[PDB]
Structures are given as C-alpha cells and as structure tokens.
Design a protein around this ligand. Structure first.
Ligand code: HEM
Ligand code: HEM
Ligand SMILES: CNCc1cccc(-c2cc(F)cc(CCc3cc(C)cc(N)n3)c2)c1
Ligand SMILES: CNCc1cccc(-c2cc(F)cc(CCc3cc(C)cc(N)n3)c2)c1
Ligand SMILES: C[C@H](O)[C@H](O)[C@H]1CNc2nc(N)[nH]c(=O)c2N1
Ligand SMILES: C[C@H](O)[C@H](O)[C@H]1CNc2nc(N)[nH]c(=O)c2N1
Ligand SMILES: [Zn+2]
Lengths: 409, 413
C-alpha cells in the first residue's frame, strides 16, 4: 500500500511508494517495535538473485532496462557465478552502488550530497602496505586543505571469509585513550581497548590527550600491520570561543575528517568488508557526543566551572548552558580555520529538502528518526516534527563484527 | 517471536532482558519490512469479542492480588460471563477500575513519568448523567490535583461506551488550555494551535475576552447529547508568571502558564470496555512548556523576541542563537514554578527517574514498554540517560488510546 508521512509543523504530507521495494528486515514486527535498537539481529544459490536485482536496478537507472547491454551483463554475471562462485562489478556499477549505499543509509542526515561522492577503486590491492597507500591518498584527497570532499575507498570483496580485508580502526582518524594507574582515563575513553591493541602490537604511545592512533590494516586475512598516517595529512582545529577567551586554555582540539572505516558495503550480494568513507562533520558530533558524553571526553563539568554556573541543582540547567557554549566554540573554530563543517540547524534543513526531492523523484526516502534528530535542541530543528518511514534498501552499508573477535592469528 | 529480547544501555553497558513483550496485544504499525516508530498516529464490541478481552483482564487482576484460580476468581469470571451474555456488556468492580486505570498509565509507552504510576487518585464518575454533573466532577478533579501547587496525579472516569451513540466526551483536548484567535491580517493572538477549538467555543456561545492567555471554557458531552459550555472557576486555575533569575527583562515579556497538565481526549480501555471520557492529570516536565509550548514555531514562538532582548547575533544559524535562548527560556520556566512552589520536574531528573523505573520494571515485571521517540526530551537529548538507552515498544492493555475528535463524529441534535 501507499504510506503517508506528515510534518506536524508544516502539515506537509508525503506519499511513500519506495518502501514497496525493500527486502532486508527492519527488526520490528507487528507486535514489537525495535526502532531504538542500535544493532537489531554467500553461495552461488543466494548470489544470482541478488546480483540480478542489482543489475536490473542499475540498467533501470541509466534507462536501458531490458537492453542488449542489460541482457548480456545478466548472462555474463550468471556464467561468472557458475564458474567462480562470485563475480566482479564493472567500474560504473561499483560507483553506482557506492553512491546508492549512501543514498539508502537511513541513519545519515547528510544525504543531500549523496550523488557527489568520489569513489576510489582499490580492488587490485593485495597487502597492508597497499591499503596504507590507498588510505593516505583518500585522506589527502578528502581533506583538500580544509575544503572537505566526500570520498570512499573500496578494497577487495570478501571471498571465503578467511581472506577478509579489514580496517581494524573504527574510524581512520581517532585519538588514543589510556587507562591511568589511579583509575581515570587520559585521551578518548572509548578507544582504550583499541589503543591497547595497538600498544600490544608495537605502537609507541606518546601518552598525550590527542594522540592520533596508527592505522591497523589487514589484507587478505593476514595479521594486521601498523602504520603512522603522515602528520601533514591529518588536519586539526584548535577549539576556541568567540566570546570566552579562557576557552582556548582548556587545550581542546579535534580533527577535521570524519571517516568511518568499520562498516561493510553490500552491492549485488557482494560484500566489501573494507570500505572507508568520509565526509565532513556536523558540529554536534564533536560538541555534544565526542566532548560531552559521560563515557567520552566528558568536559561539561570543567566548562561549567569556567562559566561559574551554579552546579548544585540540575534544574539550573547548567549542563544545557555549557553544552551550547561548547558547540558554539566548535563551529566558530572550524569556520575560522576554513574547515568544512555544518551546524545542526543547516544540516536538518538540508535533510528536509532532501526528503522532498526523494519523495518527488524516487517515491520515498528511508530515514531513522532516532538517528536523524540531532543530540541537542531536537524540537527546534525541523526533522523533530517530520514523520519518517524506516526501511532497508540495497545497496547498503551494514555493521559487521569487530575484527579482533573473529581473526585467527 | 523469541522468548527473551535484550536491550542495551550504550553509556553504562547495562543489558536488560525483556519477556513481558510476549503479552503484547494490539499492533504497533511496524512490519518486518518497515518501521513506523516515528509516526504519531499509526461501532462497539460484540459479545464474542468481549468475552476473551474480559477474561484476560480479570485473569490479570486476580493474578495481581495473588488469588489466581481462587473461588473468588472463578466466581467473578462466571458473573462477568453471564453479564456479557444477558446484556452484551459488563460493569467493572471499583477495585478493578482502579487497578485498570493505574495499569493503563503503567503501560503508557510514551510517558516518561511512570515511576509514579501506582500513586494515582482514581475518581469513579460512572454515575454521571449530565454535562452539569461532568462539570462538577471535573472541577473537583482540578481542585484535588492542583492542591495549592502540591500537585497530585489523578484520573476521573465517566460512563463507558454502550452503543457508540451515547458517548461521554470532553471536547477539550486538555482541561486547561489557552484560546487562540485568528486575525483578519493572518496574525494570531494567544495559542495558535487552539484556533479551531476556540472558534467552536465561540460558535457555541463563548464570549471571548480576546487576550493572549485566556483559559478556554469546558465543552462537555454527556450520554451522546450536544455538548455544553462551562467556565472553570478562575480560582481553580493555578498559573505561574514566568520570570528569569538573572534577566530582569524576562518578566516584561508578560508570559505565564497554567500549573496543571490534564489530558482529556484519550480513551481508556479496560477489559474490552471503552471509557471515552477519562481526563487524567499529573505535573509538568519543564520542557513541555519551555521548549514545546513557547518555542515551537506553530505555538507561542518566542525564540526571536527572547534572542532580541538577549542581544544575540541572529544572522547566522551557526551562532546557535536559537539554542542559547531556548536554554534561558527553560531556566526561567523551572525557576518560576519552583519559586511559586508549584510542582515541576526538569528533564534531567525525570529521565533519571525513568531509567530507575524501567530497570525496576524489567526486574520485577519482565519489561517496560517505552517509545524512545517520545521519552527523549525535546532539548539536550544526549546529555539525558534515556538517549543512550535502547527501548522496546509494544502495546499492553489496559491502555490509553487516541480517538477521533468529537466534532468530526458528533450527530447534532
Ligand atoms: C558529506 C557530509 C556528511 C554529513 C554532514 C553526515 C552526517 C552524518 C551524521 C551526523 C551521522 C550520525 C553519525 C553518528 O552519530 O555516529 C551520519 C551517519 C551515517 N552516515 Fe553520513 N554524513 C556525511 C557523509 C556521509 C558519507 C559520504 C557516507 C557514505 C558514503 C555516509 C554514510 C553514513 C552512514 C552509513 C551513517 C550511519 C553510521 C552508523 O550507523 O554508525 N555519510 N552521517
Ligand atoms: C505525574 C507526573 C507525570 C509526568 C512528569 C509525565 C510526563 C509526561 C510527558 C513529558 C509526556 C509527553 C507529553 C507530550 O509531549 O505531549 C507524557 C505523555 C503521556 N503521559 Fe505522562 N506524565 C505524568 C503523569 C501521567 C499520568 C497521571 C498519566 C495517566 C494516568 C499519564 C499518561 C500519559 C500518556 C498516555 C501519555 C501519552 C500522551 C499522548 O500520546 O499524547 N501521565 N507524560
Ligand atoms: C554508534 N556510534 C559509534 C561511534 C562511537 C564513537 C565515535 C564514533 C565516530 C568517531 C569518529 F571519529 C567519526 C565518526 C563518523 C560519523 C560520521 C561519518 C561521516 C561519513 C560523516 C559524518 N559527519 N560523521 C563516528 C562512532
Ligand atoms: C502530540 N502532542 C499533542 C499536544 C499538542 C499541544 C499541546 C499538548 C498538551 C497541552 C497541554 F495543555 C497539556 C499537555 C500535557 C501532556 C502531559 C500529560 C500529563 C498527565 C503529564 C504531563 N507532564 N504532560 C499536552 C499536546
Ligand atoms: C514526527 C514525530 O513523531 C513527532 O514530532 C513527535 C516526536 N516526539 C515527541 N515527543 C513528545 N514527548 N511529544 C511530542 O509531541 C513528540 N512529537
Ligand atoms: C539507544 C539509541 O538507539 C542510541 O543511543 C542512539 C540514539 N540516536 C543516535 N543518533 C546518532 N546520530 N548517533 C548515535 O550514536 C545515536 N545513538
Ligand atoms: Zn518499528
């Protein structure tokens, strides 16, 4: 059936037909909704239907459905799955599939940009040194001296599961975190375990508060190897405040490039277990989550101190006051250093415009309200009031197990 | 469905295990292929439909009092069954009415305030016959719940539906709301959300004072008759002028709000019976007023004027002038209620209490249905503990349900 979504602020109603194409499960049933669950729970036989469906939508996207080129490709893919148990995507199909995995990512508020994505084909890579080279080229290209450009680098697909290419880092650029003897934590507390794995593999930690972690890269199922990204490639922004001159004395900085490297890219039934992709930051990712999550840098206390706020009762809203000032400083700093960043008001505005575009030309837009609404000031952004339907379209980005739980050394 | 479902808290690593979802009754709106978890809204019962719905509720009640299978349990089952047989409906005992109402709150997946669910004063108004009598019952509710600012949660329950043509209804969506007036030039005075209901009241005879904060009259329908207008005595309507602990100019905005949030358009379902007029009230979380009532673009929409008096740069969104003013507005609301000793709860305290409640319910009851989209506050979401808490949403009965607005369905006499 046709489903309607209403915006309760503007009363705009949209009609979704695109959900009729979905396949993968959401995790919900008619009796239980799992919309706030973060992770809800091949062979020649399963592979050809998936390949067929993807080729079908590719040749439908370039308006040659049923053409001779379409027919030949379908035959070509069938023979190749027969004789090799897999198949290789054409360049054009790889690019189309990577763009549509982004387009279909229901949890991404930045998808108005989906068709502007630089795709780096790294399927000829065979070693961790080669992965390192490809990743350095990605970082330099995407950083572009602060004028960030979206990019993805795609390493060889999975074959038997025993020869997986993996980036062990969850993101290409992250700060280390160290367990202190006295119990507390220096650096980024989320990364304490991964930092420990790097140390155990030979990394010499500077034991500072903003130590860029090395890359830990696994090619063809072999043991992973360490590499230091050249520092001139890692763009950083010292965080200061436009009115509070003491804010710079907090000593805070962050990196310019957000680059997810632990997800799996699925295209036509093929699985690309190493596909680092990067864009640019929304300010709240750093200012709310990275800095103010209790289990992260957790700086609200210190900032509220320097603002001299009354911190004895929660109803003074001292946490909310310090949170806003921190996020002002983040946006001010990136902007002053001409490093691409988007605030949550502008980003959610763009996303509403994007939904409008997608309903018009595509018949829908899968969207996960739980992830789309920003982690602060929710209802004064327009996505808060926008009903969204969430469903799974392929090509897709998926979660996968952490490599240190599966790898045999 | 599987027997055990797990939810994780991503901040604390606590894992909880839910088995109560096996008792879920109606539908969520979601399917295997689509999730409707952010959709706001995704004739009578026959003798055959009513029998099992009543047995399920009676079984649950007698289980709750540790008398499942007792002689009083089997006798009550037989009495209910005979009564459905001869009359096509049945009447709840007072004990069962109170149990049912408290559990409809306990089961209300969108309510963050449920740690209080067992402390609800239930007013049995099933003997009411006229709109004047409904007015009396509602006035007593308001006075009891307000308690001079020491608010007490309460529900008043009017006669259940019979054939669907004799419904009791409070036409107001909430017992206390401010009027809104559309101007010829397109501007609105008062609360823009209430223009439609205000016009109905005016048509029915209400003489509107045409101010910014005019308490609307009650519009009360008894036994399916045409609704009738009544003015709530103003001394029963407790109000708080909003001032700011630092900004002396904030009082010059002339803002105020009423102390008592009382939802009156929902339907209470107990054992298959339908209570179409069941006004219930608690106390406010500050953000309901400071974020939604005052700062929604389609409501009072004061962010601009507050930002002006704060002398913020309003030319770029990246200055976060909106966020800065939103916090100060919510500081003022909490400060003004606390100063006047009117019960209110901030979003930090309320979500912390909800986590403790949910954990206790998981341990004692086997689960706690919760709608994350509604539980997470409309500001500063991720610095409250519920943001990081995975939730399962499902529908347990007794329950509160939405129902059609009565002006869309009423057959005028
Ligand atoms: C161009 C600017 C972009 C912006 C402003 C943006 C914004 C965001 C934000 C704020 C999130 C939530 C992240 C979190 O809370 O962890 C997100 C998630 C996500 N983004 Fe985008 N993004 C951008 C580019 C991209 C690109 C280039 C891709 C892939 C090609 C992508 C795919 C995704 C996916 C798959 C998620 C879900 C991640 C997860 O489930 O952990 N995004 N995005
Ligand atoms: C005692 C203090 C209470 C607090 C602090 C509280 C808090 C809240 C809040 C913040 C909401 C969201 C409201 C909105 O965004 O419109 C809500 C919704 C709700 N509450 Fe509670 N509540 C309380 C008492 C009650 C009581 C006494 C009942 C019923 C007996 C109740 C049943 C509900 C229901 C059914 C909803 C869903 C409303 C809807 O869908 O429109 N609550 N509550
Ligand atoms: C489910 N959260 C997992 C988690 C926990 C802690 C940190 C992170 C995380 C760390 C990073 F360095 C970077 C990110 C990128 C998120 C992201 C990705 C893209 C393409 C654009 C954007 N604008 N943003 C996410 C992710
Ligand atoms: C989907 N929102 C519908 C909507 C829209 C605009 C206003 C309202 C609304 C108006 C009011 F006077 C009062 C409320 C109270 C909601 C509520 C109820 C209770 C028992 C405790 C509490 N703390 N809060 C809600 C509701
Ligand atoms: C579209 C979305 O479902 C809608 O805006 C919801 C979001 N969450 C909410 N949460 C609460 N408490 N109250 C609301 O009115 C809403 N509105
Ligand atoms: C439990 C809940 O699903 C979890 O905390 C989610 C909520 N929404 C989110 N939204 C974004 N953008 N990022 C997140 O990490 C989360 N975490
Ligand atoms: Zn769902």
């Amino acid at each position: 059936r046709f489903l309607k979504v209403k915006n309760w602020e503007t009363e705009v109603v949209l009609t979704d037909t695109l959900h009729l194409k979905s396949t993968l499960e959401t995790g919900c049933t008619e009796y239980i909704c799992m919309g706030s669950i973060m992770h809800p729970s091949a062979t020649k036989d399963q592979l050809f239907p998936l390949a067929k469906e993807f080729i079908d939508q590719y040749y439908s996207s370039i308006k040659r459905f049923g053409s001779k080129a379409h027919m030949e490709r379908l035959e070509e893919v069938n023979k190749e799955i027969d004789t090799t148990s897999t198949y290789q995507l054409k360049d054009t199909e790889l690019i189309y599939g990577a763009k549509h995995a982004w387009r279909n990512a229901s949890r991404c508020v930045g998808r108005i940009q989906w068709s502007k994505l630089q795709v780096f084909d790294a399927r000829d890579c065979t070693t961790a040194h080669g992965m390192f080279n490809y990743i350095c080229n990605h970082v330099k290209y995407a950083t572009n001296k602060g004028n960030l450009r979206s990019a993805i680098t795609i390493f060889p697909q999975r074959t038997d599961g025993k020869h997986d290419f993996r980036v062990w880092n969850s993101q290409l650029i992250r700060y280390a975190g160290y367990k202190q003897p006295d119990g507390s934590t220096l650096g980024d507390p989320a990364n304490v375990q991964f930092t420990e794995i790097c140390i155990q593999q030979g990394w010499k930690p500077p034991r500072g508060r903003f130590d860029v972690l090395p890359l830990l890269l696994q090619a063809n199922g072999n043991d992973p190897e360490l590499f230091q990204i050249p520092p001139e490639l890692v763009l950083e922004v010292p965080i200061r405040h436009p009115k509070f001159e003491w804010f710079k004395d907090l000593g805070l900085k962050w990196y310019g490039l957000p680059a997810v490297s632990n997800m799996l890219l699925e295209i036509g039934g093929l699985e690309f277990s190493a596909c680092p992709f990067s864009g640019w930051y929304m300010g709240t990712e750093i200012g709310v989550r990275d800095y103010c999550d209790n289990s992260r840098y957790n700086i609200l206390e210190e900032v509220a101190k320097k603002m001299n706020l009354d911190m004895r009762k929660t109803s003074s809203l001292w946490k909310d006051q310090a949170l806003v000032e921190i996020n002002i400083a983040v946006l001010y700093s990136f902007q002053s250093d001409k490093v691409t960043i988007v605030d949550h008001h502008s980003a959610t505005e763009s996303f509403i415009k994007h939904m409008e575009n997608e309903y018009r030309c595509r018949g829908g837009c899968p969207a996960d309200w739980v992830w789309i609404v920003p982690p602060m000031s929710g209802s004064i952004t327009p996505v808060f009031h926008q009903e969204m339907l969430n469903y799974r379209l392929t090509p897709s980005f998926e979660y996968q197990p952490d490599p240190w739980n599966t790898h045999v050394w």
